[PDB]
């Protein structure tokens, strides 16, 4: 199911060819009181940039956005809305800044409109500097 | 990059209306009474009390 590309997909930490007579999984708690989810501990994907089961460390900023598009692979576009205060007219103006964000295959069923918390880490790509730490499903979505 | 002040300041403000009979006739009495030599001698001191009155006001508005 995995190992679709040319090179062999594996977790570089663990050794998988111990002489004997299921594969163990590398994972870590990421601090700041975030819960290492179950698809990370139990699942069978290979992701360099998964913040729980991969080589990337969360440090600096922690922000939240709402999911806009999910079309490019293992990555989403979130949209961060705020108000900017002009001082001449004692009023605000509605602005937005949509940023590219790495979504782990851990967070399996995520829909658009979900309130996604992200954490800053080392530059992953040209435009990607953040990584999804948790997802809150949009108000309801029970039915 | 010279080691100097450049910190100067004007000590007088000239009045907006240049030819008020009331103001000309007022200020000349003070010049003759106290033996000042020009109108700037009066404008200087009008500016010093204007600053004092302004700083007094700004404090007099403050939350007690």
């Amino acid at each position: 199911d995995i190992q679709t590309e040319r090179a062999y997909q594996k977790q570089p930490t663990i050794f998988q060819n111990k002489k004997r007579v299921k594969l163990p999984r590398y994972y870590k708690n990421i601090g700041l009181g975030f819960k290492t989810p179950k698809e990370a501990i139990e699942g069978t994907y290979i992701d360099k940039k998964c913040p729980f089961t991969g080589n990337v460390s969360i440090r600096g900023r922690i922000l939240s956005g709402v999911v806009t598009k999910m079309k490019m692979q293992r990555t989403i576009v979130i949209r961060r809305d705020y108000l900017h205060y002009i001082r001449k007219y004692n009023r605000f103006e509605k602005r937005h800044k949509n940023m590219s964000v790495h979504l782990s295959p851990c967070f399996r069923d995520v829909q658009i409109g979900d309130i996604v918390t992200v954490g800053e880490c080392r530059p992953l790509s040209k435009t990607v500097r953040f990584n999804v730490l948790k997802v809150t499903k949009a108000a309801g979505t029970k039915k | 990059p010279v080691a100097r002040s450049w910190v100067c300041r004007k000590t007088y403000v000239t009045p907006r209306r240049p030819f008020e009979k009331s103001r000309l006739d007022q200020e000349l009495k003070l010049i003759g009474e106290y033996g000042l030599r020009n109108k700037r001698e009066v404008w200087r001191v009008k500016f010093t009390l204007a600053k004092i009155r302004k700083a007094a006001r700004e404090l007099l508005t403050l939350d007690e």
């Binding site: 601090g31 700041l32 009181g33 440090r59 600096g60 922690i62 | 990059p1 010279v2 080691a3 100097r4 002040s5």
Partner: protein, 262 residues
């Protein structure tokens, strides 16, 4: 620029040096050393401006090039050498000993000590580190490495070193009800008793400190230096004992002393 800078313009120099505007263009760019450039006091500024032994740069050079000045029991013939917080300047021929500690305001005090007190200093630990063969290392605030420390000392404790041997005598552990001087921020030189440490995972931990007159002030944990157990200072404190009375009180004390003086 294309490399490290060597000049320091007199306006861009740290303010607590209290440098005038019309003397020169440049200020003494402190040589690299144990303390930071913004948190030091160069040997030239301390010697010529505070004590006023020297009159000019040539006289400071002449005073120090005779091997007369001795910063932390080691002779220094360098005019721009950064003498910082918790140092023992030992001018030998006059028989004086000075310790650089923050005045009640954001400046260094000319604080004379006794030769018995001028044989140790009070260093804060910055990191504890495991060596090349399980040899534990300390690194203190003044860039001073000590290997084989006490196995108890941890990353915000204060140690007391002997100045010749350069080894730990005692240590004050970072916890509530310990005297701390503030060595950064607006509260620069306030002496008070630690009240509460508030952990902030990711951010800087903020520590609430209480003064001797029930005055309470906070500062981030980076800018704290414990100098005593309970309420007991382990060194001599400057006149005022890091209180910072209000401008209203400081006005009253000044003019009342003037009235009584005459």
């Amino acid at each position: 620029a294309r490399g490290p800078k060597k000049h320091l313009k007199r306006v861009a120099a740290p303010k607590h040096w209290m440098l005038d505007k019309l003397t020169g263009v440049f200020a003494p760019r402190p040589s690299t050393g144990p303390h930071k450039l913004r948190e030091c006091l160069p040997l030239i500024i301390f010697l010529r401006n505070k004590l006023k032994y020297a009159l000019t740069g040539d006289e400071v050079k002449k005073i120090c090039m005779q091997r007369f000045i001795k910063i932390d029991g080691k002779v220094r013939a360098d005019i721009t050498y950064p003498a910082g917080f918790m140092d023992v300047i030992s001018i030998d021929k006059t028989g004086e000993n000075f310790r650089l500690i923050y005045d009640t305001k954001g400046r260094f005090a000319v604080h004379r000590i006794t030769p018995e007190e001028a044989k140790y200093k009070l260093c804060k630990v910055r990191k504890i580190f495991v060596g090349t063969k399980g040899i534990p290392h300390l690194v203190t605030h003044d860039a001073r490495t000590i290997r084989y420390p006490d196995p108890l000392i941890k990353v915000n404790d204060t140690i007391q070193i002997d100045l010749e041997t350069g080894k730990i005598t005692d240590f004050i552990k970072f916890d509530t009800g310990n005297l701390c001087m503030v060595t950064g921020g607006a509260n620069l030189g306030r002496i008070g008793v630690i009240t509460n440490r508030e952990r902030h995972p990711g951010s800087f931990d903020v520590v609430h400190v209480k003064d001797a007159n029930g005055n309470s002030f906070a500062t981030r944990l980076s800018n704290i230096f414990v100098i005593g157990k309970g309420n007991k200072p382990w060194i001599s404190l400057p006149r005022g004992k890091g209180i910072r009375l209000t401008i209203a009180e400081e006005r009253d004390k000044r003019l009342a002393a003037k009235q009584s003086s005459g």
